[PDB]
Design a protein around this ligand. Structure first.
Ligand SMILES: *[C@@H]1O[C@H](CO[C@@H]2O[C@@H](C)[C@@H](O)[C@@H](O)[C@@H]2O)[C@@H](O[C@@H]2O[C@H](CO)[C@@H](O)[C@H](O)[C@H]2NC(C)=O)[C@H](O)[C@H]1NC(C)=O
Ligand SMILES: *[C@@H]1O[C@H](CO[C@@H]2O[C@@H](C)[C@@H](O)[C@@H](O)[C@@H]2O)[C@@H](O[C@@H]2O[C@H](CO)[C@@H](O)[C@H](O)[C@H]2NC(C)=O)[C@H](O)[C@H]1NC(C)=O
Ligand code: HI6
Ligand code: HI6
Ligand code: NAG
Lengths: 530, 532
């Protein structure tokens, strides 16, 4: 009758899962497991509370609701943007996690991968097709866990010092899920002593912040940061600016009639009302800037991530970090003047100079001049194709590449063993224009083995590539070393060695854009202080 | 009795010259013509006064004295440094000029080349062997003129506003010599309506300042600036810093028994022996540095109504032809005079710490932030500690900051504002060069080829270098005659295409960009950083 492999008892009660099909065999999935009380009504903006025990059997056969978030409408119906939009109904009752295990369930402790999705801390969901864990679990025989966490104002609105809206509760949602993994993953066959965190963009920034927060450190053992870092200029906000943004949001939604009255009024508004106004609390026009992000208030982060990275002892830590070939191109169509996915975006010098202030917001004119000096080819100062690639480099280096390069350099120089990559394969199914190259976020589908889905149109070569990348990632989760063949050397602050990931065998190189990142990481901070 | 070819009457009186032998035939030389009253005693620091007329015949038959100046002591007996030291006795009685003309004297008016030597405004002389004008006149049949002008404190000590030491008198010496050319060069067969100034280093900066001073602008028609520009960070000084340096120099020599009344301060300075002033001249510089000189032209609203940069940016230069250029390694020569770890006698493979310390020596008197901006751009962050790369990088720092980027900025603005510009880079290392190999083609070592020194038979240049020298003399003379060095073609320099030619044994090769990336930092960004 009923498959005993799909019945699991966790600390809170009983669950019923579903058997999933994959080209290489079945997989056990437990989707929509509640790990927190629904953060609704008076519980909104508050830290999550552990889910109370239940009687009966929870149906864990389908994904649960997506946390309330903005839905992108720039190119309606376009696959390049719809693949990131919510594929389930929106709700504040969204604190659920998902578990994939081999079928039948492992009888021996199995290494655990925990996925934290990205989306600028304002969007994302564990239920997106591109995060389907069935292929990783079947091919590499790990336990895969992913959780939903609150985004936008619901997860990161902060009136610092107030208890009604302390901030960082979305990060606490992630920590609660990691604590749930420690207490319950063995019931699925997972090994709670071998937990690897991996995430992309804001998910990678989240992974980095769990590395720098002592209460989260005991919950995992290895970390993978893809196209993101906690020291990115978009990843955190100071207490003063957080209070300003929280206050303006209240004003824009008709609040208030102290912090208590302000939060109480915010709690009376429908969730969609807060979503409709959250982008308007940003101080200026920009790309790669987000309204409600983690706040540095001395609690979750006792100091800025950059400060915590410099003062940290990282011996015994192994981290896998990397970027895609063209980190900046995706963001240019959301505000940079002259850009669009439907033409070549061959911009003029005037549009380039205007894009610099959009891509590098909230800096002095002198700082902007330094950017223009560094990213101008003064033998071809007005060539539109060069200007298009240059502004993509500005946005990509400033927000992703150089923050990741700095994290990798400091971690390596202070005990950690770092492996660095650059993902350089443009998917044959990529629907973005060719000038965007390999855009932000389009390595994920290969890490998750999506090309193995036979109902998709990836090539035979791309399937072998996905299997290669799944092996690297799983090798790292098992041993802290992706290697098995051309060897992948560790990244060091001196040699700065990394590998390129594409259809060709591994190629070792030096320097994660060393010349450009010396500007962003070494000189520009000095310029802004004086 | 006499040779009429060697007798000339100028406005001041009669002159007698000499007939010089050259590998290609005779040349008339009138060496040591007085063009000003000796600036001695009460006239020290004063503007030059026209030479009073004389009766009889002045023998203009040999070079006159070198103006009082410092004598380099760093590598005694070394050919590389002794070639720039005085080859005549030092004297304040030094305001004499020289005229070379073809033998026999030209039938028709001939274009005139006027040479202004360099030496950081503290040294130099028209009598140096490398400035011998006989080969240019023989090969290209022009009239060549060179003059001595006061250097160091005697030419550029400035108490601005005062009448006893108004400053810039060395530039006034040059202008007086230019006025002399206008009134008298026709007696030698020269055309006063076709006068081409050319100079190197501080001489090139001098040429540019005459371009930007209206009283001088009417005295010539074309300009050549070799490895120098008036907008260089070393070429001018503000009124306040000039007064500070002049006051500390007076204080260092006991004047007066600091500052005070200007008339009495200078009167005390006039009682000091010339050598005493020279001995303390370098002590007034604010910090340890290279390519910085104590007494230089002062921007005081008179000779220079504004900074050279502002005058360049506001200037209308239609109808002007200009030839500018640099050598391949402008900075290397200056590093052995103070940069830590450097020497002509070893490889100068410096460390990272010596590189950072040399940056402050090579870019003196800037904020810590500006210094780190220099480090950011001249460090290869894949090889931040490689000694050979650091040695080249510090050479580039000093060369770009002081020569290449000032010249590139001068060339770009003149071209954009009406002038026709031709740019070169001199890339030949002479076979006779005595400096070590790591210095490449150093500052000042294109001059000997422009003056045709390789044609001197007692020298040891190769036959290839003699052909090269004759080719360069043709470019310079073509430009002096027509405003165009051509007749492989040499395209003009423009702000957009930024085209220049390489001068070496190979034929002309057209390139783009006078180190465009580096000079965008020095000319565009760094000024914004200093004002904020
Ligand atoms: C500074 O002093 C000069 C005069 O220089 C000498 O020292 C003076 C104290 C006096 O002894 C002069 O005779 C010496 O020549 C001043 O200029 C003189 O001023 C007087 C009175 O007006 C006049 O009769 C002289 O002709 C002037 N001689 C010149 C032009 O040198 C000058 O005014 C003083 N400036 C100050 C106040 O600092
Ligand atoms: C090359 O020499 C320089 C400076 O030194 C002089 O020339 C040398 C060839 C040798 O003859 C020395 O005895 C001379 O003093 C070295 O850099 C300097 O080293 C001296 C050591 O006293 C010291 O002043 C500073 O550290 C450096 N700067 C100077 C010029 O004072 C350089 O290290 C030598 N190159 C090597 C070591 O290969
Ligand atoms: N008046 C002085 O004491 C003095 C001291 C030092 N210097 C400059 O040092 C020598 N130098 C430094 C750099 C380039 C060339 C030279 C050679 N000059 O003859 C000039 C004057
Ligand atoms: N205006 C913006 O900066 C912006 C930011 C983010 N997005 C949507 O990002 C979707 N996304 C979400 C998660 C991970 C990656 C990605 C992007 N490309 O792969 C649109 C506009
Ligand atoms: C040039 O070389 C020759 C042969 O060695 C020598 O006799 C002569 O003195 C040298 N002259 C110069 C200028 O060096």
């Amino acid at each position: 009758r009923e498959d005993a492999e799909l019945l699991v008892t966790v600390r809170g009660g009983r669950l019923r899962g579903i058997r999933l099909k994959t080209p290489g065999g079945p997989v056990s999935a437990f989707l929509g497991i509640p790990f927190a009380e629904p953060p609704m009504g008076p519980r909104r903006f508050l830290p999550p509370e552990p889910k109370q025990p239940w009687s009966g059997v929870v149906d864990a056969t389908t994904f649960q609701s997506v946390c309330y978030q903005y839905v992108d409408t720039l190119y309606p119906g376009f696959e390049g943007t719809e693949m990131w939009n919510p594929n389930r109904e929106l709700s504040e009752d969204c604190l659920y996690l998902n578990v994939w295990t081999p079928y039948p369930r492992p009888t021996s402790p199995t290494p655990v991968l925990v996925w934290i999705y990205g989306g600028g801390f304002y969007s994302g969901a564990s239920s997106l097709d591109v995060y389907d864990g069935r292929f990783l679990v079947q091919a590499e025989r790990t336990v895969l866990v992913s959780m939903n966490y609150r985004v936008g104002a619901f997860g990161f609105l902060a009136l610092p010092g107030s208890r009604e809206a302390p901030g960082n509760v979305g990060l606490l949602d992630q920590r609660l899920a990691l604590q749930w993994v420690q207490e319950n993953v063995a019931a699925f066959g997972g090994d709670p002593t071998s937990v690897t965190l991996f995430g992309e963009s804001a998910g990678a920034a989240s992974v980095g912040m769990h590395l720098l927060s002592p209460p989260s450190r005991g919950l995992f053992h290895r970390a993978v940061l893809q196209s993101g870092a906690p020291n990115g200029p978009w990843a955190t906000v100071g207490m003063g600016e957080a209070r300003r943004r929280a206050t303006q949001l209240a004003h824009l939604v008709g609040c208030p009639p102290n912090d208590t009255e302000l939060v109480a009024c915010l709690r009376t508004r429908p969730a969609q009302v807060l979503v409709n106004h959250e982008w308007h609390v940003l101080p200026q026009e920009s790309v790669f800037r987000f309204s409600f992000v983690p706040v540095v208030d001395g609690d979750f982060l006792s100091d800025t991530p950059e400060a915590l990275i410099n003062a940290g002892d990282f011996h015994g830590l192994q981290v896998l970090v990397g970027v895609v070939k063209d980190e900046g191109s995706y963001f240019l169509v959301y505000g940079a003047p002259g850009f669009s996915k439907d033409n070549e975006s061959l911009i003029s010098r005037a549009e380039f100079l205007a894009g610099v202030r959009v891509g590098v917001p909230q800096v002095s004119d002198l700082a902007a001049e330094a950017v223009v000096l560094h990213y101008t080819d003064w033998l071809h100062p007005e060539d539109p194709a060069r200007l298009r690639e240059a502004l993509s480099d500005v946005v990509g280096d400033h927000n992703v590449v150089c923050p990741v390069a700095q994290l990798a350099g400091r971690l390596a120089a202070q005990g950690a063993r770092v492996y660095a990559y650059v993902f350089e394969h443009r998917a044959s199914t990529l629907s973005w224009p060719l000038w965007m190259g390999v855009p932000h976020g389009y390595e994920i589908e290969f890490i998750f083995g999506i090309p193995l889905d036979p109902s998709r149109n990836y090539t035979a070569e791309e399937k072998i590539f996905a299997q290669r990348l799944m092996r690297y990632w799983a090798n790292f989760a098992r041993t802290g070393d992706p290697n098995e063949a051309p060897q992948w050397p560790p990244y060091t602050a001196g040699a700065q060695q990394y590998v390129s990931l594409d259809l060709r065998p591994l190629e070792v190189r030096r320097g994660l854009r060393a010349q450009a990142c010396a500007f962003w990481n070494r000189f520009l901070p000095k310029l802004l202080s004086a």
